[PDB]
Scaffold this active site. Structure first.
Site, short mmCIF file in Angstrom:
data_model
loop_
_atom_site.label_atom_id
_atom_site.label_comp_id
_atom_site.label_asym_id
_atom_site.label_seq_id
_atom_site.Cartn_x
_atom_site.Cartn_y
_atom_site.Cartn_z
N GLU A 197 0.85 -1.20 0.00
CA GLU A 197 0.00 0.00 0.00
C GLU A 197 0.88 1.24 0.00
OE1 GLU A 197 -2.96 0.32 -0.55
OE2 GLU A 197 -3.99 -1.65 -0.05
N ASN A 220 -7.90 8.71 -5.53
CA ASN A 220 -8.74 7.71 -6.18
C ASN A 220 -9.57 8.37 -7.28
OD1 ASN A 220 -9.32 6.64 -2.81
ND2 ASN A 220 -7.92 5.69 -4.29
N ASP A 260 -12.67 8.36 -7.80
CA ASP A 260 -13.92 8.96 -7.37
C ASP A 260 -13.71 10.30 -6.67
OD1 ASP A 260 -12.96 8.27 -4.83
OD2 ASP A 260 -14.69 7.02 -4.30
N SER A 274 -11.91 10.71 -3.82
CA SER A 274 -11.38 10.44 -2.49
C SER A 274 -9.86 10.27 -2.58
CB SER A 274 -12.05 9.23 -1.88
OG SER A 274 -11.77 8.06 -2.60
N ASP A 321 -6.42 8.20 -0.45
CA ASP A 321 -5.93 7.19 0.47
C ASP A 321 -4.72 7.77 1.20
OD1 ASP A 321 -7.84 5.38 -0.56
OD2 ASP A 321 -6.29 4.11 -1.53
N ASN A 334 -8.97 5.25 3.25
CA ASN A 334 -9.70 5.95 2.19
C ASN A 334 -10.66 6.99 2.78
OD1 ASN A 334 -11.24 6.69 -0.04
ND2 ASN A 334 -11.42 4.64 -0.87
N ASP A 339 -15.37 -4.70 9.70
CA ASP A 339 -16.65 -4.25 9.17
C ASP A 339 -17.24 -5.23 8.16
OD1 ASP A 339 -15.67 -4.39 6.76
OD2 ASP A 339 -15.55 -2.19 6.43
#
Ligand code: NA
EC number: 3.2.1.17
Length: 129
Positions: free
Chosen positions: A35, A46, A48, A50, A52, A59, A101
């Site tokens: 990562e 990202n 969209d 967003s 990281d 994110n 989650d």
């Protein structure tokens, strides 16, 4: 801060990640390698809109507020900048919420594609733990 491999392994262990939700330490180290290259300051945009952040590339879409991700959530209740600190506490505590989650470490694309099903114990080989 750019951690050494064994240095990050030790810090993650101290902070309670070894076998957290059943993921051995080598999983977490492998994930961080691919990562962020073990760099707490890593950031990546990202598609969209967003971003990281940090060693585990958490994110802004869901987990932190960076002031420029519309319609997103802040489920870790932190500014995204906290994820860039030399101290990995915020990244680890937020990662524990993420991995709990329901989707486990599949939330991390790099883990899924580069660590899952491999010999992840190799990432902690030689480390004093
Ligand atoms: Na957010």
């Amino acid at each position: 801060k750019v951690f050494g491999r064994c240095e990050l392994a030790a810090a993650m262990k101290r902070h309670g990640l070894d076998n957290y939700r059943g993921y051995s330490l080598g999983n977490w180290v492998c994930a961080a390698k691919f990562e962020s290259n073990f760099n707490t300051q890593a950031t990546n945009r990202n598609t969209d809109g967003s971003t990281d952040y940090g060693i585990l590339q958490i994110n802004s879409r869901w987990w932190c507020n960076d002031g420029r991700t519309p319609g997103s959530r802040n489920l870790c209740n932190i500014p995204c900048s906290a994820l860039l600190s030399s101290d990995i506490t915020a990244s680890v505590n937020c990662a524990k919420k993420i991995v709990s989650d329901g989707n486990g470490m599949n939330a991390w694309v790099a883990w899924r594609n580069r660590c899952k099903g491999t010999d992840v114990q190799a990432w902690i080989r030689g480390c004093r733990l």
